């Protein structure tokens, strides 16, 4: 589906948490994680 | 072009073609060693792999 942007900006902290989320199975991509805050 | 060395924004040492590195696209225009900024190996792989994703240094965030 549709997305609010074509660039999602990650700080180191945010990228690290997002990657944890994906390895957990909670999300499929760090982009999905980003969209929920 | 001109022959140059691109220093890490953290440690100020050379970032070369076999370093694992990121680039701040939000303003400072510095390359950084992945290690110097605290990026996990997994976060680095996922940023690089996701075409919609972009990294930012701590100074440029605000
Ligand atoms: Zn460095
Ligand atoms: Zn920066």
Author numbering:
A (entry chain B): 317 to 353
B (entry chain A): 743 to 804
From the manuscript:
To resolve this, and to investigate how the deviant pocket-divider of the Pygo PHD finger affects histone binding, we solved the crystal structure of the Drosophila PHD-HD1 complex and examined its H3K4me binding by nuclear magnetic resonance (NMR) spectroscopy. Although dPHD-HD1 is far less stable than the human complexes, we obtained diffracting crystals under several conditions, which allowed us to solve its structure at 2.7 Å resolution. An important structural consequence of the W > F substitution is a significant widening of the T3 channel: this is bordered on one side by F773 the phenyl ring of which is less protruberant than the indole ring of a typical W pocket-divider. This is partially compensated for by a T > N substitution at the opposite channel wall where the bulky side chain of N790 protrudes into the unliganded channel and thus narrows it. Abutting the F pocket-divider in fly Pygo is a striking groove, walled by F773 and E767, and floored by the aromatic ring of F765. This groove is not seen in human Pygo in which a conserved L (L345) fills out the equivalent space, substituting for F765, as already mentioned. Key for the interaction between PHD and HD1 is a hydrogen bond between an invariant T in HD1 α1 (T328) and W797, the PHD signature residue (Bienz, 2006). The topological equivalent of this allosteric triplet in the fly complex is W797, L781, and V764: W797 and L781 engage in crucial interactions with T328, and also connect with V764, a residue lining the T3 channel.
